[PDB]
């Protein structure tokens, strides 16, 4: 499993949420941040944790929905996640052997 | 080392802090976030040794759970190096 | 690639910002957080760099964020497998 982290223009949040929803990715954590790629501008961090095989689909959904083609569009990082635990059940999601 | 990241109900922060404190885990970073499994949630991050992960995860699950939808999730991410800014001492993951 | 994550005193942000700029590290994400060591207001700074730039980035942050007192914070180095430029769709793979 992987964490897909995108830092986007704040106005793109609804586009990104919709593009992820449409593909079955509803779960997300959103953080208000500041960034730059000269003052720090308001940006929005979107984080989703998905199965390895869903990464490329998630990355492409975010790129398509967050892009303008201008500087300041932001970046997406893919970080490994070793375990994902559902607090309500205690069930842990891992990659088989 | 691992970073244990939990996204919990904001009212559960003190429960989680206490459960971690009781087991010797005092250090933490807390961020105000929004989420859906967008409502206000709290992100708690602790960086621990590999052998402490299961204990930390179970302390958070026990103290943040309600059994209802919206309890949140815990992610375990690898940490390769941890540096103390005050001393410049670096802890490097076993190899 | 790696993500270098530093949790620093809020007053040190400008020092860190400048020390990274001077070395060619302009890209960064900043988050307002609360923290305590092993809750007070702190600042999280995140930079994603090539593997060979990590030690230089860590050095720049340590030098610019330190006071020598307790509460100076910590730096964590986390692996980044893919880095995507949203504007072009170009992906850098580790």
Residue numbers in the entry:
A (entry chain B): 1 to 37, 53 to 112
B (entry chain A): 1 to 37, 55 to 112
C (entry chain C): 1 to 38, 55 to 110
Please share text taken word for word from the publication where this structure appeared.
PII proteins are key sensors for the metabolic nitrogen status. Af-GlnK3 shares the canonical fold of PII proteins, consisting of a four-stranded, antiparallel beta sheet and two connecting alpha helices. It forms a tightly packed trimer with approximate dimensions of 30×54 Å. GlnK proteins, when activated, are sequestered to the cytoplasmic membrane where they bind directly to their corresponding Amt proteins, physically blocking ammonium uptake by inserting the T-loops deeply into the transporters' substrate channels.
Af-GlnK3 was isolated without the addition of nucleotides during protein purification, resulting in a structure without any bound ligand and T-loops that were disordered in the crystal packing. Without bound ligands, the T-loops were not found to be fixed in a distinct conformation and were consequently disordered in the crystal structure. Given that the intracellular concentrations of the nucleotide ligands as well as of free Mg2+ are estimated to be rather high, it remains doubtful whether this ligand-free structure is of physiological relevance.
